[PDB]
Amino acid sequence: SLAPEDGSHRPAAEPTPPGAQPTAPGSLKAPDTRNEKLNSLEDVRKGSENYALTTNQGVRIADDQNSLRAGNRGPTLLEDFILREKITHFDHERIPERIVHARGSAAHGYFQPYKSLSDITKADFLSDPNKITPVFVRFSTVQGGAGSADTVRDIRGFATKFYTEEGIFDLVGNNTPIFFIQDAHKFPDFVHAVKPEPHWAIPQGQSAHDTFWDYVSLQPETLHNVMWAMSDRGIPRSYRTMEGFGIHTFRLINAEGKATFVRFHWKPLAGKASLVWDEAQKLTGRDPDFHRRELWEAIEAGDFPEYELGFQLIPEEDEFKFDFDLLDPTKLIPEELVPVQRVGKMVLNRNPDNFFAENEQAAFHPGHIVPGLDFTNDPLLQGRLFSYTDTQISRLGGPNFHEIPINRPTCPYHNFQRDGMHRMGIDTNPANYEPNSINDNWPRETPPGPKRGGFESYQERVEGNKVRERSPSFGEYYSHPRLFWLSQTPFEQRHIVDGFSFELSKVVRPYIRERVVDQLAHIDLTLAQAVAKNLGIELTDDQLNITPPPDVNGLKKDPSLSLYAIPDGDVKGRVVAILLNDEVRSADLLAILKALKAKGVHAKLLYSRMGEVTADDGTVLPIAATFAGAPSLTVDAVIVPCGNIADIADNGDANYYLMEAYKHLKPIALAGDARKFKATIKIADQGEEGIVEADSADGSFMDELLTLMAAHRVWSRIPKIDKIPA
Amino acid sequence: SLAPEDGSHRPAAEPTPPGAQPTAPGSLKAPDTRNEKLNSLEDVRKGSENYALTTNQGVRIADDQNSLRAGNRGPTLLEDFILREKITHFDHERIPERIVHARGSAAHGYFQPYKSLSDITKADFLSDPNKITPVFVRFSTVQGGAGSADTVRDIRGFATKFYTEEGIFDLVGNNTPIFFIQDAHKFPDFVHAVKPEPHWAIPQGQSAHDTFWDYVSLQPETLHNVMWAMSDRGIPRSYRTMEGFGIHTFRLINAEGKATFVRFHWKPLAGKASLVWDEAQKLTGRDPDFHRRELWEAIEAGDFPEYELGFQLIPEEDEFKFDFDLLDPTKLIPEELVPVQRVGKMVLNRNPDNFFAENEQAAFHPGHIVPGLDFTNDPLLQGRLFSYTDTQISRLGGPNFHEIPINRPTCPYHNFQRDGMHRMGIDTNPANYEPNSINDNWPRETPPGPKRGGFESYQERVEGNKVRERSPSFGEYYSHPRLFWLSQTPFEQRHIVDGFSFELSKVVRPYIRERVVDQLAHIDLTLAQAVAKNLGIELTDDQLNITPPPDVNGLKKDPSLSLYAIPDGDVKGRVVAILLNDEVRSADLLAILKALKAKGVHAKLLYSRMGEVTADDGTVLPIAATFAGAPSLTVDAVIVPCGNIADIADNGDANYYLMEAYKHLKPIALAGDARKFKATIKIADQGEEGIVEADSADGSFMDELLTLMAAHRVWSRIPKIDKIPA
Amino acid sequence: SLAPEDGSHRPAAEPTPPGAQPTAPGSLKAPDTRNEKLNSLEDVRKGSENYALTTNQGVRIADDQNSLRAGNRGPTLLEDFILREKITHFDHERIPERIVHARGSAAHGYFQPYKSLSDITKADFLSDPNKITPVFVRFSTVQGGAGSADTVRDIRGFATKFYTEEGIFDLVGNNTPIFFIQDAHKFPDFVHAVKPEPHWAIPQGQSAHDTFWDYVSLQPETLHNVMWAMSDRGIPRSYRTMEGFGIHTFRLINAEGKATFVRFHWKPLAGKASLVWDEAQKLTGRDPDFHRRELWEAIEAGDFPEYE
Amino acid sequence: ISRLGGPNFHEIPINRPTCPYHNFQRDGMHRMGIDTNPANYEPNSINDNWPRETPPGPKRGGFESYQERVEGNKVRERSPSFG
Ligand code: HDD
Ligand code: HDD
Ligand code: HDD
């Protein structure tokens, strides 16, 4: 027995805040969290406790420490079948990673609609407010490999597998409402341009290189999503604090056959929140797994990520009433023109057991729709339908990928397909064809109907010649980037300018920079001049005379496009760093932890070493991490309680901890003699907005601090940070 | 509803003789035949009746007759995900075939020992006469593809998967007691030589071509198994009527650690029986699926194939007592020197449900042993141990092939292996490594012991230098071919001579034939001269003075090596053709069928067309096949009842039916005016042995016939067939 | 030296009638027969005479008869990399066979048009009577596996790969002018019906079983091709003595953008000739490789298959 | 076999030897080399046994393992000297 007698090796099977316990597989951490999909996976789950170590053939292994050899110092013998099996499996562990979105993090949950949508869709999972549909959701980046970092500047993926009673429905979206390109034929072109360059495979997880901006400068259709990626949208605080969109216009079909155009939205319950770039870039080095960890730990804490599903709904006769083409995925539908209507809510409440088996092997594909839903002629969606079935043949080893447990439907599935690599199902049907008499033609077709019917495509009208040709209605590239730009706050605009500037500064060929600046001058001259200034470029008089693009159906801004314009913050699930000293004033800490617990805010107690310290009243305080081990990048605010401040007053890591949080605009709270730290951040004796300070942490100290946290960051501090050396 | 109203599309779920019902998947034909492995497969068995036709994602299909197109005479649309999923799966149905033994047929069954064997082995499946071990057995040829024919001249494989309580044990044997080569390094060379030649991929399923006999002429070690292949052993009547051998010497390990050398035998309860060459070769054309079909139909009729397992046992101190090396797999152990001792019996009593899922995907490997068994230094076996693990990585798509359902153990298996393509099992173990504290080191090693202990290799002494070198004790090539030859009956010897003669006639390069004849002269000069005469070769004076090889430890012959020297014929399961006419004598047919049923001999009623005829007493007789439809190749004897014999007397197909069966030495019985047919086979009025004849089928008629059948063929007829034009 | 002293191991590199000589690889049997595609393959052709035996890494092997073992009656050692490379490659020799048409026989050749088809198509390989196009042609059955027999009763495939100056053009046809089914959605249903039945994988290379005729009775569209299958068209004397058809209506596009509907045909120079059924069925037993053999040997005789 | 798709990974250009390589191995996924040898086995007479084995020697000779002495029982055991 190698476990410790005190049993401290096993985490408790109950919700615990991040860092209190070792993380564990979901069925062990929360065995009583169940749904119909989790239960169906029990047949393939494998335990371990009280079992013998065997080969894959069931043979008990006596000595798992040594190869078989001719003498204890002799050659290894080919007849060691236990070695060779163990090494063979190891030698073939890896499978191809996803072509795009290879880096991702996933969890189980459930979905439930608010009310029956049977008036607009016959889709069964939206027909009754009491119908609960299990889900599996994978969040992702786009460009980086499976081993790349979480907090890069990138688009994020948001893929939801609905295990419906009438088929698997995959909603395969991103965290922005549009994509970079218009036609699927260009997808390898765009992806090759953004991916690491083919001679040397640099850089990983970054669009800040020549070939990406080269493609953008020559393809202005890309400009809208590029705007989004250069904003703080491209660097989310977590997957819980981002939006989701299906991007394409789809169709809803009701029992009477009426089609309604629809676009899908996920609204985060935790609000919209993003990092700032210096923080996001450094965090890819201090913790490349930050988003993966934060997701797992929130679920282990009970901080279940929640999202409200919503629809923008457009009648068929309104197809042409907007300036933009509904079928153009580089165009958004402003919520000011078509509101998002609440449909239901999704809760992610259990982690997987084995990342490889459940996350890496999961297969999402937007062609996986159910009766009540249908496609449109969006030329990007159209080509997606081919790719997501095709790519699985190599990634997941063949055509039986639906038999891998995480991908199996929970509803019945029967047909006349047979064979293929690693076929699990053993068909007893006398027939493998239809029409057949020898099994009385079963399984049988089902006619279309209002529920439990067969799938039939909406009989939309088609008219035109066979052409490789872009619809002229698509050939407008600058109005929607402008609408986005004007909808941002001034500090969000600053960050957009700084994103473009930082990225173009790493383009080596200067003529590429100049061509991207010229495209910006077609969007907004304020934006283009600000970027040009940082690049040492001067706009020509002709460029200064570029007429701006028209408004979007009269709109000159839409505050739903901004992260922060309308407050939607939420402190539940946020984390505060508490910086300890060797004789902490316990009255401060008790007030701090009481206020944080009331709002569901977590705390990390940090010191210069691990182990424990003792407060003034003798209370023993366990240390979560060092100052260097858990930098301010990983928390939302910093609190410094009173006590023996001289212990850390001249500690470089303690001082830098506050300087980093200050530069990154986070709230900071100083109690008693901890107010001496204002000098390291150059805060005058009069104080300033964003620095909570008082004689002690009792009173309004923590309400000021929690109000600041509900506002996410202290945007008013931005003029002051450029003098801070951090 | 497409099935007929009389319900005649569905086979009866009861035992029925061959031809009486349509064949069916095992679980529908015999739902009440069960064992633990069959039951454990119910989780992956898929039904069909009363289920909707769906996609693999569970979506119900409305129209499975048409692609989705723009207009009903327009182009097919990329958005048809139902089409593309169906075609994709079809497009990827095939997996690589087995490098060797690609043609095979398999069945489920069970094994049971006669008594406890714990004095000599601690193997759990041999420990208790009431311990029942499920099995899955695949019989195979060697050379041809999965699409090649059954009744070729080849070696047969005989692979048994024992689903043991202490792990999978695969006994992977052949139907002869030796192999062609000594060291596994030569296996690709031998196999390439016997397989179709690389320029043009000819010939399929035949050793009768230049490169095979080239290798043989240059590799005398091959001569022993070549002798078996040229004998009638190479063309068995059924998989039920052949022997089985593990070939290599293995070890039995008992609980006190004593090692006993062992070779494995399967003795067929139905006795030993083979075809003749002209019959077997023509049958590869008339029914290339004859062995597969006969196996399947015997099981559906209740004629379960049965084999007795037996051990040749040799104490460790006797390793060097014999003239041959025990570890040399081209040498057999004569039963006259070391008898085969009975161990238990194996019954094959249910067919699979899906050939591809269960047969094609099954993975046998002789390195799959269990505690109580161990290997030896046999250099052919030693290399096999590498190959059967390695080949599955491409054939079965990766290292998780044990998770394919037919291959799964029925006992526990738990280890720290993870991932790999198609990974089914979801591991909940906090640890994927040992030693580990975080799961208190589970799953754990198990010390070896008398039962339920870990595997430990027998600590055999090893002494020598690292050499690529053949043991001198292996350098003897002719003694065992001679033993075999001399142990054969005169008619068996004639068939061997004609085997060699027919094959070498197909060798294009005459010098190869000459070199093979020189090798035979080192075996036996009677054999060598007979073959040479058929090839137009004249043995030189020196070849005539080649000294024959020595006896095998004083043994000059061993009747256990003959198919027929010791009678072991059994008639149950054999088939008789009955040649009808349009007014059969019903008293004859009544007595024929009553006697055949009394011994378990099946019958098929043949005529010049399908449908029915009526007998003289009004009885309606259903026709099973036409004369050409089911040739005499496919039956064991022929009976011609009395009646309107003129109806068929001048029918060429009916006359040829008898001539073919006569040429191939099968018994023929003729009643009443049927005796008129003696003219077509040139039998004199006073009859001859092997032709049953009487005024009616009454009396000793059917007893005479069944007596001939138990003797298999009428060997005395051989001198008469050479003048028969058939 | 293991060859006979009289050199009778080696076939002559000149045309010879069937059975006169051992068959041989084409570039050894007819090295003067060349086209642009055959010549472009010289970069990957591998010799053998006067070379040492090596591993795939180029290491010369001293003893290709024995595994490395601890003593000559000892266990085989894991460090024998020469064994494991040789057995590894052997162990992975097979690739999946074609889903349909798995059984087939192929040869090289060339094509040239009689006159310029410029008026009706701008296809380059049809623009100049002096323009030679290399081809590779595979003939096949449909139902049986790669190891099934040649003279079965089946449709035959007739696939031609044209290596034109403006791209590969594959003309993938059969020996009857129609097919069994109308819509590609039904192709796995039809193929599953004609193929060996799923429970026991019987019969090989035959449509003479329940599921095939079950489908046919329920799908009258199949009857036309079934009629060709049941005729002597289904058992050709040789690949040289059958027709070929593209089946589908395609289009020809000229330089003016005018489309012409076209159906493709191959007309055998040797004429149309078929076996009879009892003959064909017995021949799948006496020589299951009859058609592959006959094509190879006709070419070695200089008796080249030709099709218009 | 899984990482590079099969046993012909030596034919991927970066992995190819620059020296001659010839043996009797054939086929496998994505086979590039087109073998003209009449024989795919040895010993063979039909190509006069080419390509042929080479005895070990001072230069350009075949590979032979150093004939080190081996002495001991078949054991799964760490040498005490490693402890
Ligand atoms: C025609 C090609 C193509 C195009 C135009 C798109 N995608 Fe895609 N996408 C793929 C081809 C693809 C893929 C290559 O098929 C992936 C990679 C691995 C996979 O299974 O699917 C994939 C993966 C993938 C994933 C990750 C799913 C997972 O977690 O496994 C997401 C979230 C998206 N895509 C979302 C989108 C969105 C929102 C698009 C624009 C509207 C989009 N893709 C356009
Ligand atoms: C070192 C290579 C090697 C050598 C020397 C042998 N075999 Fe083998 N055998 C294989 C390598 C192999 C293989 C390539 O690994 C196969 C083909 C596909 C497979 O799964 O195993 C196989 C298949 C195979 C099968 C078919 C199993 C099934 O039905 O799936 C049988 C019955 C045998 N072998 C029996 C033998 C016997 C009785 C041998 C001589 C004693 C023998 N093999 C030598
Ligand atoms: C939608 C599926 C489908 C349909 C409707 C057809 N085929 Fe096909 N065919 C295939 C799917 C396929 C395939 C599965 O893609 C094959 C098997 C493996 C391959 O490479 O192509 C093939 C092989 C194949 C070959 C073998 C090529 C070779 O020698 O390698 C020929 C000659 C044909 N087909 C001809 C036809 C003809 C004349 C058809 C009717 C007009 C036809 N096929 C319908």
Q: What is the 3-state secondary structure (H, E, C) of A626-667?
A: ECCCCCHHHCCEEEECCCCCHHHHCCHHHHHHHHHHHHCCCC
The CA distance from A641 to A630, in Å, is 18
Three-state DSSP at B638 gives strand
State residue B190 phi and psi, 5-degree precision: -60, -50
* Ligand 3 atom closest to C139 (CA): 29
H and E: helices and strands count for chain C: 8, 10
- The CA-atom distances, in angstroms, between B264 and each of B228, B244, B267, B268, B305 are 18, 8, 10, 13, 18
Please name the helix (run of DSSP H) or strand (run of DSSP E) that holds residue B640, with its range, or none.
Answer: strand B637-640
Catalytic annotation, residues of A: 101, 174
Q: Which of C71, C90, C68 is nearest to C79 (CA)?
A: C68
Interface list for chain A against chain C, based on CB atoms closer than 8 Å: 70, 74-80, 416-418, 427, 429-438
* Amino acid occupying residue B141: T
Interface test with C, best of A432, A442, A455, A465 (most C CBs within 10 A): A432
- Give backbone dihedrals phi and psi of C250, rounded to 5 degrees, phi first: -105, -175
What's the CA angle centered on B378, arms B376 and B381, to 5 degrees?
Answer: 90
Q: What is the CA radius of gyration of chain C?
A: 24
Distance between first and last Cα of chain A: 49
Residue whose C-alpha is closest to residue B177's, from B237, B228, B104: B228
Tell me which DSSP letter residue A617 carries. T
Taking Cα atoms as reference points, which of A602, A620, A603 lies closest to residue A611?
A620
Task: Give the burial class of A370: count Cβ atoms within 10 A of its Cβ; 0-12 exposed, 13-18 middle, 19 or more buried.
Answer: buried
Q: Are C226 and C204 in contact (CB under 8 A)?
A: no
Resolution in A: 1.8
Q: How far apart, in Å, are the Cα atoms of A695 and each of A587, A670, A679, B208?
A: 12, 9, 17, 103
Task: State the amino acid at position A385 in one-letter form.
Answer: L
Q: How many CB atoms lie within 10 A of CB C40?
A: 11
> Tokens 């309580």 appear where?
B165
- DSSP letters, B662-701, are HHTT--EEEEGGGGGGGGTTT--TT--TTEEEESSSTTTH
User: What single letter denotes the amino acid at residue B182?
Assistant: Q
* Gap between the Cα atoms of C24 and A60, Å rounded: 53
Confirm if A193 and A448 have CB atoms less than 8 A apart.
no
Residue B578 · residue B606 · CB < 8 Å: yes
DSSP β-ladder status, A157-164 and A133-140: antiparallel
Structure tokens of A195? 């991916």
* Contact yes or no for A454 and B371 at CB 8 A: no
Ligand nearest to the CA of B246: 2
Cα→Cα distances B363→A645, B168, B393, B407, B415, Å:
70, 11, 11, 7, 20
* Residues of A in Cβ contact (< 8 Å) with B462: 70-71, 74
What is the least distance, in Å, from the CA of C15 to any CA of chain D? Answer: 18
- Residues in C touching B145 (Cβ below 8 Å): 97, 145-148
Q: How far is C128 from chain A (nearest CA, A)?
A: 30
Exposed e or buried b for every residue in A90-102, given b needs 16+ CB within 10 A? eebbebeebebbb
- D73: chain A residues, CB-CB within 8 Å: 70-71
Q: Cα–Cα distance between C85 and C245 in angstroms, integer? A: 46
Candidates B598, B688, B681, B675; CA nearest to B639 is B675
What one-character-per-residue DSSP string does C60-121 give? BBS-SS--EEESTTSPBBTT-HHHHHHHHHHHT---PPPSS--SEEEEEEEE--SS--TTT-
* Full 3-state SS string of chain D: CCCCCCCCHHHCHHHCCCCCCCCCCCCCCCCCCEECCCCCCCCCCCCCCCCECCCCCCCCCCECCCCCEEEEEEEECCCHHHC
Q: Is the CB of B537 under 6 A from ligand 2?
A: no
Which of B386, B271, A466 lies closest to C85 in space, CA to CA? B386
Distance, CA of A553 to CA of A479 (rounded, Å): 10
DSSP-H helix ranges across B406-489? 479-486
Phi, psi of C296 (to 5 degrees): -55, -50
CA-based nearest residue to B670, from B649, B691, B647, B648: B691
Contact indicator for D54, D60 with CB cutoff of 8 Å: yes
Nearest partner of D44 among B199, C48, B207, B185, judged by Cα: C48
CB A487 within 8 A of CB A480: no
| Residue count (chain C) | 308
- The residue in chain A having the minimum alpha-carbon distance to the alpha carbon of residue B456 is A62
Residue B160 bridge partners (DSSP)? B137, B171
CA D17 to CA D15: how far, in whole Å? 7
A561: three-class secondary structure by DSSP: helix
Calculate the CA A601 to chain-centre distance.
21
- Total count of residues recorded for chain B: 726
Q: Which amino acid makes up residue A238?
A: S
Beta bridge partner(s), residue B638: B577, B668
Q: Are B77 and B68 in contact (CB under 8 A)?
A: yes
- Asked whether C24 lines ligand 3 (CB < 6 A), one says no
The answer to whether residues A418 and A398 touch, using CB atoms and an 8 Å cutoff, is no
Q: Is the CB of C30 under 6 A from ligand 3?
A: no
Looking at all shown ligands, the one closest to residue A180's CA atom is 1
Give the separation between CA C300 and CA C30, rounded to whole angstroms: 8
Q: What number of CA atoms fall less than 13 Å from residue C158's CA on the CB side?
A: 27
User: Is the bond leading into D43 cis (omega within 30 degrees of zero)?
Assistant: yes
**Could you tell me which residues come within 8 angstroms of residue A362 by beta carbon, excluding any fewer than 6 positions away?**
A106, A136, A138, A161, A406, A407
Comparing CB atoms, the residue among B215, B394, B509 nearest residue D41 is: B215
Report the C-alpha gap between A193 and A516 in whole angstroms: 15
Ligand 3 contact via C237 beta carbon (within 6 Å): no
Q: Kindly state the tokens that stand for A642.
A: 């009173």
Rg of chain B in Å (alpha carbons): 28
Residue B492 phi, psi (nearest 5): -60, -40
End-to-end Cα, chain D, rounded Å: 36
Q: Tell me the C-alpha distance between B262 and B312, whole Å.
A: 5
Query: Are the C-beta atoms of A136 and A364 separated by less than 8 Å?
Result: no
C-alpha distance from residue A52 to each of A27, A45, A623, B576 (Å): 21, 16, 38, 55
Q: Which residues contact A200 (CB under 8 A, 6 or more apart)?
A: none
**Which is the closest atom of ligand 3 to the Cα of C100?**
17
**β-bridge mates for residue B137, sequence order:** B107, B160
Shortest CA distance to B231 belongs to which of B533, B476, B486? Answer: B486
Distance between Cα A87 and ligand 2 center (Å):
22
Other Cβ atoms less than 10 A from the Cβ of B651: the count is: 15
Handedness of CA C25, C26, C29, C32 (dihedral sign): negative
Nearest in space to C76 (alpha carbons), one of A170, A77, B109, A511: A77
Which token pair is B501?
Answer: 């003669």
- Return the amino acid letter for C215: Y
Residues 6+ apart with CB under 8 A from B661: B577, B632, B635, B637, B638, B668
**Contact criterion met (CB below 8 Å) for B549 and B478:** yes
**Per-residue buried b or exposed e for B65-77, using 16+ beta carbons within 10 Å of the residue's own CB:** ebbbeeeeeeebb
- Tokens, residue A57: 């053939």
Method of elucidation: X-ray
- Comparing alpha-carbon positions, the chain C residue that sits nearest to A76 is C78
For chain B, the straight-line distance linking the first and the last C-alpha, in angstroms and rounded, comes to: 49
**H or E stretch at A253:** strand A250-253
Q: Within 10 Å of residue B196's Cβ, how many Cβ atoms? A: 22
Task: Give the C-alpha separation, A363 to A385, whole Å.
Answer: 14
d(CA C289, CA C105): 10
Q: How far is it, in rounded angstroms, from Cα B462 to Cα B490? A: 46
* DSSP-based three-state secondary structure for B57: coil
The β-bridge partners of C52 are: D52
> What is the 8-class DSSP label of residue B197?
B
Contact C227, A467 (CB under 8 A): no
Q: State whether C61 and D34 contact (CB < 8 Å).
A: no
Q: Which of A74, A76, A437 sits opposite C218 (nearest CB)?
A: A437
Residues of chain D in contact with residue A74, where contact means CB-CB under 8 angstroms, are 70-72
CB neighbours (10 Å) of residue C303?
14
Cβ of A489 less than 6 Å from ligand 1? no
* Residue to probe by mutation, ligand 1, list A191, A225, A387, most atoms within 8 Å of CB: A387
In this structure, which residue's CA is closest to atom 32 in ligand 1?
A157
Residue A691 has which token pair?
Answer: 């620095």
Do B105 and B292 touch, CB atoms closer than 8 A? Answer: yes
> Which among A215, A301, A240, A241 has a CA at the least distance from the CA of A33?
A301
Residue in B211, B390, B461 nearest the CB of D46: B211
Identify the burial level of B545 via C-beta atoms within 10 angstroms of its C-beta, where 0-12 means exposed, 13-18 middle and 19 or more buried: exposed
A430 vs C contacts (CB less than 8 Å): 199
**End-to-end CA separation in angstroms for chain C:** 48
| Ligand 2 in reach of B383 Cβ (< 6 A) | yes
Question: How many angstroms away from the CA of D15 is the closest CA of chain C?
Answer: 9
Mention every residue, 6+ apart, whose C-beta is less than 8 A from residue A384. Answer: A172, A184, A366, A367
Helices (H), B287-348: 290-301
* Strand partners for C261: C251
Tokens at A242, concatenated:
């981002």
What are the chain C neighbours of D43 within 8 Å (beta carbons)?
2
DSSP state of A487: T
- Estimate the share of chain C in helix, then strand, then coil, as percent rounded to the nearest 5: 25, 20, 55
Task: Find the helix packing angle between B81-91 and A379-390, rounded to 10°.
Answer: 30
In chain A, after which residues is the C-to-N distance over 2.5 Å, breaking the chain?
Answer: none
Atom of ligand 2 nearest to the CA of B181: 5
Q: What is the DSSP letter of A339?
A: P
CA-A388 nearest atom, ligand 1:
15
The count of C-alpha atoms lying within 13 angstroms of the C-alpha of B172, restricted to the half-sphere facing its C-beta, is 19
Is there an atom of ligand 1 within 6 Å of A244 CB?
Answer: no
Size of interface A-B (CB pairs under 8 A): 431
A161 in ligand 1 pocket by Cβ < 6 Å? no
- Cβ–Cβ of B463/D70 closer than 8 Å? yes
Distance CA A715, CA C141 (A): 75
Ligand 2 pocket, residue B477 CB under 6 Å: no
Whether residue B445 and residue A4 make contact (CB cut-off 8 A), yes or no, is no
Nearest C-alpha in A relative to B86: A417
- Residue A161's nearest CA partner among B366, B660, B58 is B58
> What is the secondary structure of B524-545 as a DSSP string?
-HHHHHHHHHHTT----HHHHT
Chain B: which residues have CB within 8 Å of chain D? 188-190, 192-193, 198-199, 210-211, 214-215, 217-219, 390, 393-394, 398, 421, 456-468, 509, 511-512
In angstroms, the CA B632 to CA B616 distance is 26
The per-residue DSSP string of A42-95 comes to GGGEE--TT-B-B-TTSPBBS-TT--EEESTTSPBBTT-HHHHHHHHHHHT---
